[PDB]
Ligand binder design. Structure first.
Ligand code: SRM
Ligand code: SRM
Ligand code: SF4
Ligand code: SF4
Ligand code: FES
Ligand SMILES: [Cl-]
Ligand SMILES: [Cl-]
Ligand SMILES: [Mg+2]
Ligand SMILES: [Mg+2]
Lengths: 96, 567, 554
């Protein structure tokens, strides 16, 4: 399954076909979109995003607790899409 | 089109001053992104402590520049005091023969760096898009090709030192120095535009306003001595000598690097290629020519592909050599035959060759703290020793009078420091990077997890029936950047998840061979499931004295995976 | 310094061990066996759509593309019995049969061998299928090209009986004689020319008659061209050496290359000259890094003159000067044609050579009911040979009913297009080729219609899934060469003739963005081409610099 992943970035809205077994950041990269990251293994907040709609599987992450997950936060480096999903990126500083 | 954010930052900075200068003195505990990128060039890194879950706690790591790993007595004393006074109580010896000092608060940063500069030290260029610390043989041998390797490394460091004066302007308000005059041959080589290398009118004759596309790493050694892990560097320089031991020239390798990134197969570790030979008088000209070739041609669009290794992978060694030869102004000669590489730890009690001794202090992970630290400083201060850091994160106590051997040996043993004979051989050749809690790139533990792993390796050896004098090179990193050069290990663990490693095999005791990735996402808890069959099969079928590394390359991953899956 | 494959060949006892044991163990075989089984014409594959499901592809040897009736029938049945229900015609006039389970492999190969066929040397570090004009013309130079190709195939067939030992438990005397003469030989070995180590890599030869470039000659290690004589009587051969398509992304020391004119030899000399060329590659030519092993690199390094002098040592005399040849024309041999002896032949257009589901059934029914021999073309098509004039109508009727169309009813884009199999079974593929080409051709047709280009106009389109170049994309007017999961490098500058090397125009063009490149390119072609000028000739005359300006301005 490949899903439509909408990324709302400060430079503009970009649309990508991310397969279900590919991390969101890893496809962005393949398509030459510049997204933030550092650890790339789900244990920090550099790549943090907010799910506007649709859903992701991010069980591989370990930084965000559940209140934050319920609040729609997502770590783009360690998230596979599970539907067409719309994600605001570059949202780290909305925390730390 | 196509230039990275870091390029624009360098461009706007007026040779690495702005806006670092104003950010340094703002009230906040951190500094802005531009300043974060710039402060690297002055040898400091803003970090945050990832053990503290709820909130960014900022601090600054500081890294020194110590060509050959040489550390003057005055500097050791100052760094030792700074670590306790303004840091977290430790000094960290590195795989490039440097110190790092973690945990400095922004408000104390200028005090710390100034103290370094006033105490025969520097942090200039310890990070940034420039020449990193230049490696040389750490041992204070009086042997000619060793001394000449060391001098050459120093000259190269000086050649490739930033000239803008920005450093002194920020940290020391511009003063001083005192320091040695730089050797005139270095100045001459640096100046010298007879082949179009330079920006004649610039405060940076070699680096220009943009500096390099990325960090750049050089290692110098004498034929046979691979303590420096030469094949890993942008440039490897090897002193060649005649039959009598008199240096005549240098062989040169180009285009190594460890750095890669998981699931980006266009990134990879690479071994440097033999480039050719130059007469000794030519060295700085050849080196500058190599650096200028990277300066002009390395990728500045995407930093992942900026290292010289990619340019050489893409161009091939022959086209690269011809390009370097434009800036060198003449032809490289053919690369001369070299003896086989040998690793040397330089540990234990040894002779300099002039009547004085040296003692190589084994330090796990280069982490010098609590007591070991106190005792080392007492020895170094009492006997006024210069010291030297090794590329295996160890410390050499240099210039020891023979009369002092016993009291030093007593003081070290009392502090719980050990002679090589009392260390597990796995520890002696093991390395790990700092990783967590202060590395922002770490995906798991390295330094904080390696010692328990080594003991579990020892327990696998014992179970299998392998003798306790046997060993394998183990190197662990918390991510695939490869700071402990894991891709050269006989057994490399490379973090790929919060509690998992990618296992790499095929390095050799010599570091003459590139490992390959054997398995991904091996959970910390499962390590024995892989290692036991591997080492059983090594014990069962190795040839006499055959290393685990050579055994791996002879037997092949296909047969090793079969053995691991059957288990 | 020698590659892992050299050591494998060395330890194998002329390609038997450990293949022999592995064959009879698990659904797969070990790395050594994987390398060795190639020399016997089979490849272990896994299905990348799926989680390692192993199977074996097999590839035949058919000099000139000629296929006896008995073999066609056996292959057709084997495909359904033990394969995936398809036969794959290839760009070297060969069959491939995909999806065979290891436990059936010996049954399949044994059946091929017992049915006037062979897979020996279809892969491996040795002489690959020898190309020749596929059409069963009775014309002298065509027949002689065909005979010569067969002779060369036989000459360069492995002589160790390893093949027959594993799987099953005529030859013109000129060939045996040429093979046995001392350059060149290892007099005391089971392999007089190949030795224990075989070649440094695969080796590819194409033979043709002057003017006919169906075989894409310039692409081969050796290209052989029959020269005649005003009456049409063959007198000798022009030879080219050192072509190849294979390269790797971001490794600029790898590249495609056009074979150089080497010289001319009298007809009686041909097998000696060829063996001399092969031996030169055998002896020189890199065994350290496979990648720089093909003969093209040796010739690039040495230059053609030093290479010629070397070959002349093993030939025992001087090549004569390369004789002038006529221009080069591509010939598809499709449609209804005369053999020249009273009988007809019919060239069946097959998209990508993929013969399956009904087209397959109907082809077999025709071939079986009229007892036809057939021939495979280098454009992945099938020729029905030796047809009686009386059979033309029922054959035409049967083919049309099956959905197999005459050239006039096929989009001209399809008629010259090729794609490699790529995904799901190729382990090197980076993207689709065969499974993505047909929608691409339709999109190209829609760009042509939008721009106002007539539907009889066309361009050679060749697509591969990776840069190895199995559909010879680097000779295309329009080549797409996979460089990412959903992206292609676009190559331009090949000609309808295949006389010209394309160059890389753009990298990483996403599948979705193809029109963004093609529309301005073809608008400018329509707007400024000379009368009847092909897209290829137009590309070379106008130059990349102007074409990029036009693409960017759009
Ligand atoms: C301390 C030291 C490791 C050690 O245990 O001794 C080190 C530690 C870090 N390295 Fe390194 N690297 C150290 C030598 C290496 C080496 C080894 C060598 O140079 O022989 C390598 C592999 C060789 C190479 O450069 O490829 C290495 C490859 C990297 C990379 C990947 C480099 C690349 O070009 O891809 C990064 C990230 C980056 O800069 O992109 C990096 C970045 C880092 C950072 C600064 C993380 C960051 O960018 O913020 C490290 C801080 C950890 C901490 O909290 O202290 N470090 N780093 C290193 C000793 C260095 C010195 O200059 O004094
Ligand atoms: C076997 C493999 C992949 C592998 O190594 O396992 C492959 C390897 C390769 C490889 C990879 C390798 O073997 O190193 C290469 C690159 C070789 C090199 O020297 O760089 C390659 C260049 C070609 C080329 C370019 C000419 C040349 O060799 O440069 C040609 C064309 C030619 O010979 O005119 C070619 C002719 C086929 N090649 Fe090819 N080729 C494959 C298919 C084909 C066929 C079936 C393609 C087709 O659409 O018709 C080919 C038709 C030929 C035959 O029966 O012999 C293919 C299997 C795909 C599959 O799933 O079946 N391959 N194939
Ligand atoms: S290897 Fe990775 S985790 Fe370890 S110090 Fe370097 S960057 Fe950090
Ligand atoms: S060109 Fe590449 S993808 Fe296509 S069949 Fe050949 S190897 Fe596979
Ligand atoms: S970059 Fe650290 S969690 Fe994604
Ligand atoms: Cl570093
Ligand atoms: Cl092939
Ligand atoms: Mg150590
Ligand atoms: Mg076709």
């Amino acid at each position: 399954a490949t899903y439509n992943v909408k990324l709302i970035t400060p430079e503009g809205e970009v649309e990508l076909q991310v397969p279900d077994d590919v991390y969101i950041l890893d496809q962005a990269e393949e398509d030459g979109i510049d997204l933030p990251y550092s650890c790339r293994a789900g244990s920090c907040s550099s790549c943090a995003g907010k799910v506007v709609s649709g859903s992701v599987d991010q069980s591989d992450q370990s930084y965000l607790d559940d209140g934050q997950i319920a609040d729609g936060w997502v770590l783009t480096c360690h998230a596979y899409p599970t539907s067409d999903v719309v994600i605001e990126t570059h949202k780290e500083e909305e925390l730390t | 089109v196509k230039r990275s954010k870091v390029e624009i930052i360098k461009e706007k900075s007026n040779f690495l001053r702005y806006p670092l200068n104003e950010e340094l003195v703002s009230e906040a505990p951190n500094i802005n992104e531009s300043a974060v990128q710039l402060i690297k060039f002055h040898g400091s890194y803003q970090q945050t402590d990832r053990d503290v879950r709820g909130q960014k706690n900022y601090s600054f790591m500081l890294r020194t520049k110590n060509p050959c790993g040489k550390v003057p007595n005055q500097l050791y004393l100052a760094m030792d005091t700074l670590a306790d006074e303004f840091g977290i109580g430790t000094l960290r010896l590195t795989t490039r023969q440097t110190f790092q000092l973690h945990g400095v608060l922004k408000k104390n940063l200028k005090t710390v760096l100034s103290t370094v500069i006033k105490n025969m030290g520097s942090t200039l260029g310890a990070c940034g898009d420039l020449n990193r610390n230049v490696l040389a043989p750490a041992a204070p041998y009086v042997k000619k090709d060793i001394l000449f390797a060391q001098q050459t490394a120093e000259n190269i460091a000086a050649l490739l030192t930033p000239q803008s004066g920005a450093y002194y302007d920020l940290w020391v308000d511009g003063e001083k120095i005192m320091s040695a005059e730089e050797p005139p041959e270095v100045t001459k080589a640096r100046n010298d535009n007879s082949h179009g290398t330079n920006f004649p009118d610039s405060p940076e004759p070699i680096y220009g306003t943009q500096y390099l596309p990325r960090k750049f790493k050089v290692a110098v050694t004498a034929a046979g001595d691979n303590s420096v892990d030469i094949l890993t560097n942008d440039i490897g320089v090897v002193v060649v000598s005649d039959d009598a031991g008199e240096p005549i020239g240098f062989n040169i390798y180009v285009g190594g690097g460890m750095g890669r990134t998981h699931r980006v197969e266009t990134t990879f570790p690479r071994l440097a290629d033999p480039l050719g030979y130059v007469p000794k008088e030519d060295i700085l000209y050849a080196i500058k020519a190599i650096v200028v070739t990277q300066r002009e041609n390395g990728r500045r669009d995407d930093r992942k592909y900026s290292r010289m290794k990619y340019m050489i992978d893409r161009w091939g060694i022959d086209r690269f050599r011809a390009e370097v030869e434009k800036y060198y102004g003449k032809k490289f000669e053919s690369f001369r035959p070299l003896p086989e590489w040998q690793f040397n730890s330089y540990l234990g009690w040894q002779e300099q060759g002039d009547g004085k001794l040296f003692y190589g202090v084994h330090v796990d992970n280069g982490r010098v703290g609590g007591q070991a630290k106190k005792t080392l400083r007492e020895i170094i201060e009492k006997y006024n020793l210069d010291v030297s850091i090794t590329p295996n994160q160890n410390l050499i106590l240099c210039g020891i009078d023979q009369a002092w051997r016993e009291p030093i040996t007593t003081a070290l043993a009392q502090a719980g420091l050990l002679e090589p004979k009392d260390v597990d051989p796995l520890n002696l050749t093991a390395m790990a990077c700092p990783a967590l809690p202060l590395c922002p790139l770490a995906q798991t533990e390295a330094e904080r997890g390696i010692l328990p792993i080594l003991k579990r390796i020892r327990a696998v050896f014992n179970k299998v029936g392998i003798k306790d004098s046997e060993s394998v090179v183990v190197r662990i990193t918390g991510c695939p950047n490869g700071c402990a050069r894991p891709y050269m290990a006989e057994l490399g663990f490379v973090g790929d998840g919060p509690k998992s490693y990618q296992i790499w095999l095929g390095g050799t005791p010599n570091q003459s061979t590139l490992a390959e990735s054997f398995m991904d996402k091996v959970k910390l808890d499962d390590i024995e499931k892989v290692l036991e069959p591997l080492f059983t099969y090594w014990n069962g079928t190795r040839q006499e004295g055959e290393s685990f590394g050579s055994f791996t390359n002879r037997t092949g991953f296909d047969k090793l995976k079969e053995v691991v899956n059957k288990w």
